[model samples]
Target: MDQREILQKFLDEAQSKKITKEEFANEFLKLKRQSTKYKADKTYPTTVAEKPKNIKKNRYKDILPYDYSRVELSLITDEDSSYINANFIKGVYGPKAYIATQGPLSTTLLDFWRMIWEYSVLIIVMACMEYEMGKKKCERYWAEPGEMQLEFGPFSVSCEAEKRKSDYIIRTLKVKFNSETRTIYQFHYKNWPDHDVPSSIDPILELIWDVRCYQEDDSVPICIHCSAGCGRTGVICAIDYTWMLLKDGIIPENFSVFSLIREMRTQRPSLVQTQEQYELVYNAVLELFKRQMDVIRDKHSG
Candidate 1:
């Protein structure tokens, strides 16, 4: 009877008897067996990504990246620092909100657009798909429609148009480097695009409410992905980090999703990896707690 009192008794039974999918498979397999016996944390280390010059920029060389919230990539040449399998995953809107990467490779696609031009990312949630069964999981960073630019060498990209939301594909990029340009969107979520698992979570809660109504700036950092970025990119960073803790109402009578994947696996390492993406993060937090209790019952039936 530990683990935040079984995570506030499944958040007060998902706010009183509304949780299903077999009670989220009996609370996501008994809260992943009480996070391996009431976990106290400590297994977070990736040994500088097993050096040898960061070993081929990892596509899944055991999905590493936790030298404490990785995502370094800055010092260009004092011997060239920065590596990018990406990490930085905290939420309730803080610590770079979300960037559990790894979908860029073909030689790291210029270090994934130089980590989207040093992390002032606008919003990119590509939850897997750039071919998934003949291999090559994610390598096409961006730029295709009309292709005006697409350099990635000194950094340059362009898409500017593409809107087809049947299950996602927004794409409105334009990230130039030193010239300083930036304007990214890229939902691209084609609904669990492969490796099975999600039968449906309302098109991933409608692509996380279409990136929270096209994102204004909850401190810019949505950049997720899916190939060895730890299973469906750690279930969209643990279901958008509990949908920003129910949009910052400050939910804390003991929340859980295996304590947000044991605090995002100490900043990245098999985040929400299996068990059907840990049952798609408790069925997308019981469908966002029944769509936030039906919008508070349509605003109190006003």
Candidate 2:
């Protein structure tokens, strides 16, 4: 039979017979496997471990990539210091400074309590799965939160959103004003579509600069993170750091964005894995800096 006749025959057969859930799932996987483009190692390069030491000179290169084996081992040994130093980009794992890797989600939740008890970190931002375009719930995954406790501060907020192709709603939260003296706090978010730069970066930076310089408040530093603690976070940090260096009359003409990111990767590897993401972020930083320079020139009429 021809293609159309063959398809019609199959559909007729399928309609005539009741397929079990497992059978349907198996068929689905087969179809998905056929439709998906599986590119192997073309996108990922050889390990930087093989790269020459001389070429990896950028300060950004100091940040390291993530190694699942090491992270798991540190968690297993109860090496809170090592774990915190490596995996944590901003805040402590929980309320406390340490976390245990083994056991159920409850274990992590309890560990969060311990973190809070020790580190004085009152705010806990939880990252969860987001449902796909039409879905309302997230796909279940290990390492997800089951329950938790939190302390309220002067300001507290939580947000939930459905991310594209995600299985669960992403939940984020903020808590501030824990100091003996009072202070003002604000939280912001930007969801750039895939391959898009967040429009909020400049505004966020200006807000932060205002808080520290304009308002003369130095109670705390801004914290940021993304999956694997690098990509998005590293780019923003690099931008801010580069701006600081330039403003101080330090020419970064010789700086390497790749190397600069590698520095961060060395300490916390997952900084930037994709070459495309790396280029996009670098361009975004330069674009932002140029805008700031234009403002300065206009003000000085130079």
lDDT of 2: 0.35
Separately for all candidates shown, the number of backbone clashes (residues 3 or more apart, or on different chains) is 1, 41
- Computed on alpha carbons, the lDDT of every model, listed in order, comes to 0.73, 0.35
Alpha carbon deviation, residue 63, candidate 2 (Å): 13
lDDT of 2 by residue, 46-151 (tens): 2332235412311233443233322222222232322221233321112112111111122133332233333343222222123324542221111222333233
Model 1 scores what on Cα lDDT? 0.73
lDDT of 1 by residue, 1-302 (tens): 54234445565776786655666567667655654553345456677887868778887787788777888887243233577778888777568777888888888788776676676778888876788678768888788688789787888888989888788889888888788788888888866633244456778777877788888456777788877777777887788778767655456766767677767765776677566667667767766765665555576697
By lDDT, who's the top model here? 1
